Design a protein around this ligand. Structure first.
Ligand code: ATP
Ligand code: MG
Lengths: 134, 362, 69
């Protein structure tokens, strides 16, 4: 049930964000993420989180992306592995980013998100290496 | 026929020759070496208590027998014959080998938080001991499953014993007590020696208040002996020699009578309360214990739970058993909600004979 | 000092409480905070962890009737 509903919602909401970026898709996906988080479905939550960061990235969102990453990370009882996929997606995103100010801003946001979490330790280490290289 | 006849006779010949060879052998007195004197003189004390200086038969690799090692002295000349591994008492052996049935965690109801605290203390530190090293702590060592009678402490202990792999030592604290001088303290010492020898180990003491009762300032000689046993136990847990990979679980329903030194955070680190089932816990226990009963109606488990206020898990099991009793008494090969209601009211009436149950540590 | 705390702990709030607790109790509090951090899969202990550990360990609060004072 959850797999079907998430795979049905993700393309429709992605399209709705694409032709307008109305951003109501963000709240719809947040409600679906809450449902899957309660149900403990892992792959679902992972897909919703990665798609949320996806669309926030294709949209030229230099602040909404950071805010949404923070809220998603600090939600009530999210799945550690789902947040792990989200952070991995954010790392492969920040890799291909110019514009030093927003580069550093997103790097710092990810560092703050993953300060002291074992499941994201390797990603934070690579992120710190990237920050030091910059 | 002579072939098979002589074959069987030759087999019995081998057996009888082995028996005679055994018959031509005498026993040897087991002692422990205390020190080596002159490469041929060893101060060894026989377990019976006397101490001697004895010789050593040649092929013993004197380095193998160091102060404290068990040896087999000859029964006549008392000369060492062979070094032996550390003794395991028959008591400690059966302690380790008791069968905890095959209880699974699916047979325990309202205890979910308590189950995961017990598992936190027991399993994870012994399977991934480096996470706690990274965080910078030494994982907790002792658990006190304390609660009203029949709330599931011993059932939880049985489930842990059945579902975990590391060595496990079953013991009722009242089955350690012996009338001999120092025997109980010696038995506790042997418990912890076995645990240290088999490094990943758990020691479950059921109804600890048999031994770990408060220390009397005006007690009798028996009380003083049992207090010696208790203090040996306390030293073993958190004395001079640190305990590594040996965990303690202790079950009780009168925690208020336990020694403060025993209840100290250093010895019994985590005291978890197996409280009487709440509404959902009662529902879960009733489902668990009525699953195998052939019910042939619509069962308002909610109504049974509502009338089961103040019950324990054993009380709910008895509710199921009494519903069955009503079934047999009515000559029915099944149970119904009228039977369950009668059973729960009967158990509620039986509960009137109890007394204070809300006993807490400290 | 042996643990790795987050800079938001501020152990002073826990120290300045009216509880008669031993060094073993303090070690138990810190140990339970670390245990909670491990439970949540973090290698840094937070003020949340210390609050929960203290409330779990120092549970001596009972009685002290208010009309005696
Ligand atoms: N939470 C529970 N879930 C299921 N069954 C339970 C539970 N608690 C008790 N029981 C039932 O109680 C009986 C065993 O109780 P147990 O020996 O665990 O009690 P205890 O809490 O150790 O009490 P005591 O203080 O009397 O030794 C079995 O019938 C077991 O099914
Ligand atoms: Mg019991």
């Amino acid at each position: 049930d959850y797999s079907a509903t998430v795979d049905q919602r993700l393309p429709e909401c992605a399209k709705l964000a694409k032709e307008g970026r109305l951003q109501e898709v963000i709240e719809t996906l947040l409600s679906l993420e809450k449902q899957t988080r309660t149900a403990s479905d892992m792959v679902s939550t992972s897909r919703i989180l990665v798609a949320v960061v996806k669309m926030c990235y294709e949209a030229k969102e230099w602040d909404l992306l950071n805010e949404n990453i923070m809220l998603l990370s600090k939600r009530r009882s999210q799945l550690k592995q789902a947040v792990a996929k989200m952070v991995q997606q954010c790392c492969t995103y920040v890799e291909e980013i110019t514009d030093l100010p927003i580069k550093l801003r997103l790097i710092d946001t990810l560092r703050m998100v993953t300060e002291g979490k074992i499941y994201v330790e390797i990603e934070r280490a690579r992120l710190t290496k990237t920050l030091a290289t910059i | 026929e002579l072939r098979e006849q002589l074959k069987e006779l030759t087999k019995q010949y081998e057996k009888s020759e082995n028996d005679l060879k055994a018959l031509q052998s005498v026993g040897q007195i087991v002692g422990e070496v205390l020190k080596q004197l002159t490469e041929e003189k060893f101060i060894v004390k026989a377990t019976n208590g006397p101490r001697y200086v004895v010789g050593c038969r040649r092929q013993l690799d004197k380095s193998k027998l160091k102060p404290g090692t068990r040896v087999a002295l000859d029964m006549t000349t008392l000369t060492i014959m062979r070094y032996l591994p550390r003794e395991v008492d028959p008591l400690v052996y059966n302690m380790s080998h008791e069968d905890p049935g095959n209880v699974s965690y699916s047979e325990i109801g309202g205890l979910s938080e308590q189950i995961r605290e017990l598992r936190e203390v027991i399993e994870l530190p012994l399977t991934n001991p480096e996470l706690f090293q990274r965080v910078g702590i030494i994982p907790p060592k002792g658990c006190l499953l304390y609660g009203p009678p029949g709330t599931g402490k011993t059932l939880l202990a049985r489930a842990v014993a059945s579902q975990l792999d590391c060595n496990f030592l079953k013991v009722v604290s009242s089955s350690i007590v012996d009338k001999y001088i120092g025997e109980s303290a010696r038995l506790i010492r042997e418990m912890f020696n076995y645990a240290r020898d088999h490094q990943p180990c758990i020691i479950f003491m059921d109804e600890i208040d048999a031994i770990g009762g408060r220390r009397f300032s005006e007690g009798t000689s028996a009380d003083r002996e049992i207090q010696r046993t208790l203090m040996e136990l306390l030293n073993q847990m958190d004395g001079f020699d640190t305990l590594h990979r040996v965990k303690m679980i202790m079950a009780t329903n009168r925690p208020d009578t336990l020694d403060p030194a025993l209840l100290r955070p250093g010895r019994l680190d985590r005291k978890i309360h197996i409280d009487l089932p709440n509404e959902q816990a009662r529902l879960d226990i009733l489902k668990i214990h009525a699953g195998p009963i052939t019910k042939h109606g619509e069962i308002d488990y909610e109504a049974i739970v509502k009338l089961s206020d103040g019950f324990n898990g054993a009380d709910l099991r008895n509710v199921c058993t009494e519903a069955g009793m009503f079934a047999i008494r009515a000559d029915h090969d099944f149970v119904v909600q009228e039977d369950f209601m009668k059973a729960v009211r009967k158990v509620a009436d039986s509960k009137k004979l109890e007394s204070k149950l809300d006993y807490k540590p400290v | 000092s042996k643990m790795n705390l987050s800079e938001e702990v501020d152990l002073e709030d826990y120290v300045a409480r009216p509880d008669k607790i031993s060094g073993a109790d303090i070690n138990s509090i810190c140990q339970e905070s670390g245990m909670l951090a491990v439970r949540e899969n973090r290698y840094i202990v937070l003020a949340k962890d210390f609050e929960k550990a203290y409330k779990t360990v120092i549970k001596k609060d009972e009685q002290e009737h208010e009309f005696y004072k």
